Short mmCIF file of C-alpha atoms in Angstrom, two decimals:
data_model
loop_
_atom_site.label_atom_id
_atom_site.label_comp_id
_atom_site.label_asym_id
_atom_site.label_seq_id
_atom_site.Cartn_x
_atom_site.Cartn_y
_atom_site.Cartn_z
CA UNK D 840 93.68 5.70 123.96
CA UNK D 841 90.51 6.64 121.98
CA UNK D 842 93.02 8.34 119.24
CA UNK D 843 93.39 6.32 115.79
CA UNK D 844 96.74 4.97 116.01
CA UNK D 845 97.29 3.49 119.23
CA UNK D 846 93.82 1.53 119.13
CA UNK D 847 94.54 -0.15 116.12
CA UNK D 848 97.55 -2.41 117.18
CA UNK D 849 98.19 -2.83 113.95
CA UNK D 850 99.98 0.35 112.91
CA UNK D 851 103.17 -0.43 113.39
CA UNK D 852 105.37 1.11 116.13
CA UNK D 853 108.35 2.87 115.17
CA UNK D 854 106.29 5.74 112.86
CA UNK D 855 105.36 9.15 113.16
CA UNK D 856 102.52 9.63 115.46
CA UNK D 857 101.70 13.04 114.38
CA UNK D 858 100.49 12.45 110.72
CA UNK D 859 98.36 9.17 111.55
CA UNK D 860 96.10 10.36 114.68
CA UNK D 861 93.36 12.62 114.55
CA UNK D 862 92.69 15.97 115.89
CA UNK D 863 91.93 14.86 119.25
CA UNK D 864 92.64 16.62 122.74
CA UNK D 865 96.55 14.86 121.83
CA UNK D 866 96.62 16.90 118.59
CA UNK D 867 96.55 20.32 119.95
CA UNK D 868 98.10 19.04 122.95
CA UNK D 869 101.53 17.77 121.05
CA UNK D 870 101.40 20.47 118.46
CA UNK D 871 102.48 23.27 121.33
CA UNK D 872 104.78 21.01 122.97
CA UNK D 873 106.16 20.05 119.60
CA UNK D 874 107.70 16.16 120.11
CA UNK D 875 107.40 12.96 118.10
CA UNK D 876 106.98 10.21 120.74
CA UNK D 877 106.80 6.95 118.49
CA UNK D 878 103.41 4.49 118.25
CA UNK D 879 103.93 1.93 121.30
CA UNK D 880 105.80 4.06 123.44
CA UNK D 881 102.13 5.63 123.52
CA UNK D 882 101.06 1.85 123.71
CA UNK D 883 102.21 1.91 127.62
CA UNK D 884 100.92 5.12 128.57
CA UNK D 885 97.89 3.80 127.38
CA UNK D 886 98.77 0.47 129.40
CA UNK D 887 99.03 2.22 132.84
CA UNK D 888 95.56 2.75 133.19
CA UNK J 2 78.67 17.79 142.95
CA UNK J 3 80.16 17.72 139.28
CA UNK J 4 83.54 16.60 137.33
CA UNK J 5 85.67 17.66 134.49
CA UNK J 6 84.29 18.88 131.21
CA UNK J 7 84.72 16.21 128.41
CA UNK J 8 86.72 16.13 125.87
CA UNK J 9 86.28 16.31 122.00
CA UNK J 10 87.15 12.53 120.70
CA UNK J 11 85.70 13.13 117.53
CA UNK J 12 84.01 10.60 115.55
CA UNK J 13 83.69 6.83 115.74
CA UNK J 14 86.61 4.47 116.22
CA UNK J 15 84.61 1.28 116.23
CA UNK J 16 82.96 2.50 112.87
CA UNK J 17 86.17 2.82 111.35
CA UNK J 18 88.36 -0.07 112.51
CA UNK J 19 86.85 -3.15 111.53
CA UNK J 20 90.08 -5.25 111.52
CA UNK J 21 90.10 -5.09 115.79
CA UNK J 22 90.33 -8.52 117.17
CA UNK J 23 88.50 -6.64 120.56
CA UNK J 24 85.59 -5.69 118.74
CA UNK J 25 83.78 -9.04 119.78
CA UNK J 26 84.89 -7.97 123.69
CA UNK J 27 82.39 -4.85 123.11
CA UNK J 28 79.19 -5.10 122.78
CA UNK J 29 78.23 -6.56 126.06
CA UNK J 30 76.30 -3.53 127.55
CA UNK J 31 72.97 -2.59 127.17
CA UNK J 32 71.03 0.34 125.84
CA UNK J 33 68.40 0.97 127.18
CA UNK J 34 68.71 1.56 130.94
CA UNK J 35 70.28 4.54 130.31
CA UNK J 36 69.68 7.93 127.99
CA UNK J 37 72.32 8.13 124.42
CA UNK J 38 74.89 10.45 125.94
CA UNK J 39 75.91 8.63 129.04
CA UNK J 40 76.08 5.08 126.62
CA UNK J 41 77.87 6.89 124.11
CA UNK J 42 80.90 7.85 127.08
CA UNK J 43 80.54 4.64 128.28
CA UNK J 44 81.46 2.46 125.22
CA UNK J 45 83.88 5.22 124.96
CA UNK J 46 85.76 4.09 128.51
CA UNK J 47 84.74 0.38 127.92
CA UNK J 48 86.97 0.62 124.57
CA UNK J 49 89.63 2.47 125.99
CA UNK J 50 89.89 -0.07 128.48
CA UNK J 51 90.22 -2.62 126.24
CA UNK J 52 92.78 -0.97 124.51
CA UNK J 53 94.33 -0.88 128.12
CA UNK J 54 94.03 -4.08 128.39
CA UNK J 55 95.27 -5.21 125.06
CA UNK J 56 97.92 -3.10 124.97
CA UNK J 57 99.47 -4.35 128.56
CA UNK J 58 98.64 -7.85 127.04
CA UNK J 59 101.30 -7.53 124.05
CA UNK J 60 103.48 -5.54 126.37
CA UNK J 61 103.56 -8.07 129.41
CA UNK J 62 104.30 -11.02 126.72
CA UNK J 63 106.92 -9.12 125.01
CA UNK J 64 109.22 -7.81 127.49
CA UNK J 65 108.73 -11.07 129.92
CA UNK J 66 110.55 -13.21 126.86
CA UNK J 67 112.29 -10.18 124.43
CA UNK J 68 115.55 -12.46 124.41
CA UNK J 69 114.87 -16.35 123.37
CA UNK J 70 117.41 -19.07 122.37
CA UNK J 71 115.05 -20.65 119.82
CA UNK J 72 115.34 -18.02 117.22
CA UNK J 73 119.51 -17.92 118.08
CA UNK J 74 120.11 -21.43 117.24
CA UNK J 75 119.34 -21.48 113.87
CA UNK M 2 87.83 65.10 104.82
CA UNK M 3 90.58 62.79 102.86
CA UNK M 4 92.97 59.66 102.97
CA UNK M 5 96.22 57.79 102.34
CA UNK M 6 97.71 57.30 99.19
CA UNK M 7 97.03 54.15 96.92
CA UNK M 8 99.35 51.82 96.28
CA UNK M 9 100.81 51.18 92.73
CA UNK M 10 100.11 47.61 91.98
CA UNK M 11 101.27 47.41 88.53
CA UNK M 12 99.88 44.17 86.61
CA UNK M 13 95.90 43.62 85.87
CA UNK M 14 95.48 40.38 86.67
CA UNK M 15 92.17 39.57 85.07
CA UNK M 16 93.49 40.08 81.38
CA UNK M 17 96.76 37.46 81.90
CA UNK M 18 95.31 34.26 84.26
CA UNK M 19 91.98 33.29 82.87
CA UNK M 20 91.19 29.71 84.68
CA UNK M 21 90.26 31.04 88.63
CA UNK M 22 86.66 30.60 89.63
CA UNK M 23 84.18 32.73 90.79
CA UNK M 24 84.05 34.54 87.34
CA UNK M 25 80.34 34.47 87.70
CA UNK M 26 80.68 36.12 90.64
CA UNK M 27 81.78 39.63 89.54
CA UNK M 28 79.14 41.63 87.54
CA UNK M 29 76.71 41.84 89.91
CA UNK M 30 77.83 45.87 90.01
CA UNK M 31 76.47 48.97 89.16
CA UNK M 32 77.62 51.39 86.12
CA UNK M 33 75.46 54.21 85.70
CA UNK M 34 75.46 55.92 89.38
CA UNK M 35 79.56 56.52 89.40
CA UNK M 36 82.40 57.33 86.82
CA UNK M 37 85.02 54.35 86.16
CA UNK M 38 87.97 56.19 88.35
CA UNK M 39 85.63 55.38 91.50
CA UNK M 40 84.29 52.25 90.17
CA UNK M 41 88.11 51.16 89.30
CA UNK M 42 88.31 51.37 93.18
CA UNK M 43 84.89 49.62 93.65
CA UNK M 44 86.19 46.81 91.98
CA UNK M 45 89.65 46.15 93.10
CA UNK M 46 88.21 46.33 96.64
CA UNK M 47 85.53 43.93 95.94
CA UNK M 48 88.03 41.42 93.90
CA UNK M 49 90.18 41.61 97.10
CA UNK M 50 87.30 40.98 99.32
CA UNK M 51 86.30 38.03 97.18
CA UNK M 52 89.46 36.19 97.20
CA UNK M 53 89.50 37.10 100.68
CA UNK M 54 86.03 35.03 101.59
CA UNK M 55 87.82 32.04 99.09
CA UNK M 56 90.91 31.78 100.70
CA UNK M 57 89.21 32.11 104.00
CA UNK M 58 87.08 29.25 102.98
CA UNK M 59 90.04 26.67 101.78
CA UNK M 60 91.59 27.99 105.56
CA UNK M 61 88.70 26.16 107.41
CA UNK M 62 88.18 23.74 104.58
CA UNK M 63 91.97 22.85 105.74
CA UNK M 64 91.62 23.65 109.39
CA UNK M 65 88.26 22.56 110.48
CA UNK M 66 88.83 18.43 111.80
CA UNK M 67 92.38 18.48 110.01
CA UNK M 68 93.74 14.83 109.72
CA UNK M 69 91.24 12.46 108.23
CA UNK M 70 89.46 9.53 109.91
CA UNK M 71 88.36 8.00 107.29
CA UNK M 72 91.78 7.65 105.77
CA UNK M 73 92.84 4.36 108.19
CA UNK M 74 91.24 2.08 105.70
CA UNK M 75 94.49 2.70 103.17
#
């Protein structure tokens, strides 16, 4: 949650979260599992907390 | 005894977003009871639990009312 | 007591592309202590080491904090 694009609520959600976030813990820990889950679907894993 | 190492979360988000309708919902802690480092984690997990919160806020509207007979009629 | 061949490399690349930097940054050599058929080899291993510490520099200048945080304003 302390990445760039699921903070700002108002990036929309059906983009690439890859290009938009930072290099964060998340970057390096998508780039080896290589998947593109969408901004918002991120939202709710945030959410659980 | 001790915890996890942190991790890097680099730079400032609240120093970069200025268009966040939770930034007034932030600065209600204080700074000097406690040394930099430990504030500096803490607005950290106070703004991460906003986002939390805010994001289970648009979540818990939308999905409650995702179909509505309002926007159908017309 | 010796070595390995040399490669060919056919092409001098300083008399065709004219506009890459660090041209300042290639007579600070010696002349008088060896013959130019050892100093032809004391400069094409100093021209690769040099591009080698410039591309080496754009590789962390690329990979050092790689997205930009700044760039959320546009």
């Amino acid at each position: 949650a302390y990445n760039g694009p699921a903070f700002s609520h108002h990036f929309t959600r059906d983009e690439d979260i890859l290009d938009n976030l930072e290099n964060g813990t998340l970057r390096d820990l998508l780039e080896i599992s290589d998947l593109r889950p969408t901004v918002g679907m991120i939202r709710d894993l945030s959410a659980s907390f | 005894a001790r915890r996890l190492p942190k991790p890097t979360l680099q730079g400032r988000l609240e120093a970069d977003f200025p268009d966040s309708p939770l930034l007034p919902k932030f600065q209600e802690l204080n700074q000097n009871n406690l040394p930099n480092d430990v504030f500096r984690e803490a607005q950290r997990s106070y703004l991460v639990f906003l986002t939390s919160q805010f994001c289970y806020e648009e979540y818990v509207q939308r999905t409650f009312g995702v179909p509505r007979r309002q926007r159908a009629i017309d």
